[PDB]
Amino acid sequence: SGISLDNSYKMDYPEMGLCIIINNKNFHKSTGMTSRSGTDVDAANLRETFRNLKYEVRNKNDLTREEIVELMRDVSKEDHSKRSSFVCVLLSHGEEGIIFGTNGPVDLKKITNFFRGDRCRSLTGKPKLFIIQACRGTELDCGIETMACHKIPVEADFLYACSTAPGYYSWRNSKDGSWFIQSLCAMLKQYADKLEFMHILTRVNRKVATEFESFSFDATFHAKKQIPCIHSMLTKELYFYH
């Protein structure tokens, strides 16, 4: 046949893949972590968004750190041979490199390691997307008025769509959901049939950066801004359509 191009991930496997959504709203009293009002709005929005993209969505609520690790391990041991991709969404408290179970922290590297190129072989070469709504620290953004080869890296083909910049808090509205997840679902709804995923996430960055600003009776937390951060180790373009 004719000349062929391969700069995009193959997304026409029989199934798009799993979308695992871990929604941690209520935390054990002993941890002292506050309940995350509005996170159910995020979880429902993500479920509908990924359903329309033809993902097999599984929603999990209020998981302990042990349950998160066991879930991720079990999912990574499934046969994904017939699936194009894998998506995991984490909605919780966090700090840099850490996501909270209801009873304590989970190392993000531990979770993602289950899906490494050498450890989940049915996902080797396929995009593994981790979408994270959680704090990455406690900084606030004040804003400003305007030969060939035969191996691939085991860390290749991951993308971390993080709600906020490294070191910073991430904002969630108790009524509307988190700024990032609201924006992500809106941009996926409007553009998943039109734009490559990096370009969609860039529009999410713009929406969060331009349309939201915090309101607080506490001057320390008032009038603050947020920029999400895309961390891409993908090796091809990702279109949700084919």
Partner: peptide, 4 residues
């Protein structure tokens, strides 16, 4: 508005 709340932080995570």
């Amino acid at each position: 508005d709340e932080v995570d």
